[PDB]
Design a protein around this ligand. Structure first.
Ligand SMILES: Nc1ccn([C@H]2CC[C@@H](COP(=O)(O)OP(=O)(O)OP(=O)(O)O)O2)c(=O)n1
Ligand SMILES: Nc1ccn([C@H]2CC[C@@H](COP(=O)(O)OP(=O)(O)OP(=O)(O)O)O2)c(=O)n1
Ligand SMILES: [Mg+2]
Length: 576
DNA sequence: CCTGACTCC
DNA sequence: ATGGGAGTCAGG
């Protein structure tokens, strides 16, 4: 702990070297329109701290941030890039991101700050962020000398750690994953987050007013049926009503008491009509609390946009997640909740929403990977399963039936048991067991594959995706049944979900390149795991109908072709 | 603050 | 004991 640095009053030439570690510090977790509290630069010439008020109003420093030929190493460069966009400054030339490097080396470490990354290489010359800024109501920027040292120490760590991390990624054959996929993706995600999605608040507010009335109506009906008022949103109070007052059968318990899960309640429907009303009430309550009230809370009022943050270094399989607000779990399955999507509108007059999704991309990936003839030949496979489990005609398969059969296809291939399946379809365990057995004989390649991948994980201690993403599974040889079994099912699932994640990431990169090449105004707004959502002038729809599916299809080559479905409309709802 | 709800892929 | 991966909310 002895680190020399200049606390600079003004930007100098030697801070603008062609390679540098750069820290642009934002303390708030949600970095949209958040204060930049300090800057640190480390390069061959030395270590510098700059006050943002100075640096960011300095035309040479701004010029250097925006010069792609001046290469910067950082940690969480998307955070910096977006915070700078909100200050009206363009950040270019990021060549190394320690956050993403750590994530690829081992997603389980949960690396969230430079110190946590530094620990991976026994680098101790830097403090965790939480130790410097503090928690909750105590959270604050420290005295300048202490802030400056922290930011310089983070930059020095990035400076020293770049090579050891790159060296290890190369050993793992993952450097291209970092440099050619994840880092370019981060810049595209930064663009999407900053663009935001426009919301029709008048529509959303009116929906909430009508939902309020309907909640009250259903609530009173529940009270009438129960013979008493109680808090329907307390599973504890509800448990007393259902299982003590009304004396309904107890099908399941958790550590806190009687289960009132949707699965349990649906099975109690033939006992008392109050359970169906309660399920509906909790659905309506979620719509209001989360997708009306929670959404309106994060709308920026002047522009009516919502700006999600896509976490690129969180999931254990290589998927993104979306927070504050989560735009990857907007309702769609019930028409009631689906109507929320009518409030998601284009950001400009005479623009439209364009949505494109990979049709069953994951199952095609498994077909390719497991090398299964029957599955490939099938390449509707979900509808086909609903004809089987419900024993019906193809033109009698309701979108609820198909939805149920999709859950069965994914259940089975990823190791559901006879018990789970029996519960899911409310059928006999014998019948469920024979359903699973039949599936594995119908597709013997999938069967062989799932056996092999588990043994491979036991031998190596990890599993990998098509583009060499890695998940370590140290629990996989555990003496404990439940613990071992979970790890076995991650070996079955992670390579396929993770590979499907790799592919759509590549597609986003490819797509943006083409949009730029063709000088289109169309741009990405959202990714929802197997779907890309764009907005564009209405004139570009014709072109987008060919371009976007073209690019997605040709992202990778597999034994099975990738298929893209696409729709467009006035609102997200209408993009179906 | 965690748990168990509901939401999506 | 009992397919996988996520985030947000009210209650307690
Ligand atoms: N140094 C490397 C090499 C590869 N990869 C990732 C990028 C794409 C994917 C493909 O691996 P390649 O060796 O480029 O192609 P391959 O012939 O299919 O090799 P393999 O079958 O082992 O994946 O792995 C990487 O991240 N870093
Ligand atoms: N119950 C589910 C639902 C989805 N997924 C994963 C598997 C596929 C991926 C995309 O989900 P969907 O788009 O709903 O599945 P799909 O096969 O593409 O079916 P559809 O044609 O209806 O989109 O997410 C899963 O593991 N379990
Ligand atoms: Mg799909």
């Amino acid at each position: 702990a002895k680190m020399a640095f200049t606390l600079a009053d003004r930007v100098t030439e030697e801070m603008l070297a062609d390679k540098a570690a750069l820290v642009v510090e934002v303390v708030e977790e949600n970095y949209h329109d958040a204060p930049i509290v300090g800057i640190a630069v480390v390069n061959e010439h030395g270590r510098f701290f700059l006050r943002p008020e100075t640096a960011l109003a300095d035309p040479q420093f701004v010029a250097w941030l925006g010069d792609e030929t001046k290469k910067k190493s950082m940690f969480d460069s998307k955070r910096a890039a977006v915070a700078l966009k909100w200050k009206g400054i363009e950040l270019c030339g990021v060549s190394f991101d320690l956050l993403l490097a750590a994530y690829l080396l081992d997603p389980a470490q949960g690396v969230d700050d430079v110190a946590a990354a530094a620990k991976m290489k026994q680098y101790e010359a830097v403090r965790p962020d939480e130790a410097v800024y503090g928690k909750g109501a105590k959270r604050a920027v420290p005295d300048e000398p202490v802030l400056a040292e922290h930011l310089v120490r983070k930059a020095a760590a990035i400076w020293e750690l770049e090579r050891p991390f790159l060296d290890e990624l190369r050993r793992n054959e993952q450097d291209r994953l970092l440099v050619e996929l994840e880092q370019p993706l981060s810049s595209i995600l930064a663009e999407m987050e900053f663009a935001g999605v426009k919301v029709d608040t008048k529509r959303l507010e009116q929906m909430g007013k009508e939902l309020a009335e309907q909640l009250g109506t259903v609530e009173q009906r529940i009270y009438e049926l129960a013979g008493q008022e109680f808090n329907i949103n307390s599973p504890k109070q509800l448990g007393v009503i259902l299982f003590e007052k009304l004396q309904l059968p107890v099908l399941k318990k958790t550590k806190t008491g009687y289960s009132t899960s949707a699965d349990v309640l649906e099975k109690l429907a033939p006992y008392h009509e109050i359970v169906e009303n309660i399920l509906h009430y909790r659905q309506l309550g979620k719509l209001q609390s989360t997708y009306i009230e929670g959404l309106l809370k994060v709308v920026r009022p002047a522009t009516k946009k919502v700006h999600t943050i896509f976490n690129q270094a969180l999931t254990q399989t290589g998927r993104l997640s979306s927070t504050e607000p989560n735009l990857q779990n907007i309702p769609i399955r019930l028409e009631e909740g689906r109507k929320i999507r009518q409030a998601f509108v284009p950001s400009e007059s005479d623009w439209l929403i364009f949505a494109a999704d990979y049709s069953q991309i994951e199952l095609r990936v498994l077909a390719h990977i497991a090398e299964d003839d029957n599955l490939m030949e099938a390449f509707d496979i979900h509808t086909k399963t609903a004809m089987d489990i419900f024993q019906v005609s193809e033109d009698e398969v309701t979108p609820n039936m198909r939805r149920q059969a999709k859950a069965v296809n994914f259940g089975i291939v990823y190791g559901i048991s006879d018990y789970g399946l029996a519960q899911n379809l409310n059928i006999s365990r014998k019948e469920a067991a024979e359903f699973i057995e039949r599936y594995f004989e119908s597709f013997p390649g999938v069967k062989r594959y799932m056996e092999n991948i588990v043994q491979e994980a036991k031998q190596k201690g990890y599993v990998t995706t098509l583009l060499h993403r890695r998940r370590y599974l140290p629990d996989i040889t555990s003496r404990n049944f439940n613990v071992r079994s979970f790890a076995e099912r991650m070996a079955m699932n992670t390579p396929i979900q993770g590979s499907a994640a790799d592919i759509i990431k590549k597609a986003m990169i490819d797509l943006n390149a083409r949009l730029k090449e063709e000088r289109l105004q169309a741009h990405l707004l959202l990714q929802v795991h197997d779907e890309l959502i764009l907005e564009a002038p209405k004139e570009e729809m014709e072109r987008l109908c060919r371009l976007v599916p073209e690019v997605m299809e040709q992202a990778v080559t597999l034994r099975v072709p990738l298929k893209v479905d696409y729709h467009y409309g006035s609102t997200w709802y209408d993009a179906k």
